[PDB]
Write a protein that binds this ligand. Structure first.
Ligand code: HEM
Length: 154
């Protein structure tokens, strides 16, 4: 799979809006992930204790984590597919240290799409969402291949 420049444009156009407030989008996305797929929260030893959305929103550390997560993703998206260098450290830590299965990357991809659909309807119409889904599917495909190379693929 490979995206067209036109599709990359749709992806980077909405991401530019996301960047107006990375911290806020990071919070919304992680909170959506944890509420839609509670099992995912268990992978965060530093935040596994959070019981409610209120506690999640009030967590300064969770906010920092969200910023780090979206900034890393933004760098990857901006490479428009030429993200081999960026995927190496990310794949290693998530496969070997955090033990994050591909299914969970699909879950966070779903959360990203949900939040963008909610916050940016004008710039996240059907075609734009399709482009973003295509970009995230490419990300997960390449990450999965790396996982396999690293001996995890899960
Ligand atoms: C869009 C996909 C994701 C990106 C770009 C991403 C990015 C990052 C980055 C940059 C870090 C810090 C450096 C590192 O350890 O590699 C990190 C840490 C971490 N990630 Fe992810 N991540 C993603 C998805 C996930 C998912 C789905 C989970 C689990 C449900 C997860 C769990 C973790 C954990 C447990 C840490 C450690 C947090 C801490 O205690 O400091 N990540 N991630």
């Amino acid at each position: 799979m490979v995206l067209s420049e036109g599709e990359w444009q749709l992806v980077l156009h909405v991401w530019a809006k996301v960047e107006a407030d990375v911290a806020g989008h990071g919070q919304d996305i992680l909170i959506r992930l944890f509420k839609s797929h509670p099992e995912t929260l268990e992978k965060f030893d530093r935040f596994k204790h959070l019981k409610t959305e209120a506690e999640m929103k009030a967590s300064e550390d969770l906010k920092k984590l969200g910023v780090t997560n979206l900034t890393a993703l933004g760098a990857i998206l901006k490479k428009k597919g030429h993200h081999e260098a960026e995927l190496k450290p990310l794949a290693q830590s998530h496969a070997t240290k955090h033990k994050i299965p591909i299914k969970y990357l699909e879950f966070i991809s779903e959360a990203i799409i949900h939040v963008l659909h909610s916050r940016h309807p004008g710039n996240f119409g059907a075609d734009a969402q399709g482009a973003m889904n295509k970009a995230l599917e490419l990300f997960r495909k390449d990450i999965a291949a790396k996982y396999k190379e690293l001996g995890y693929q899960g």
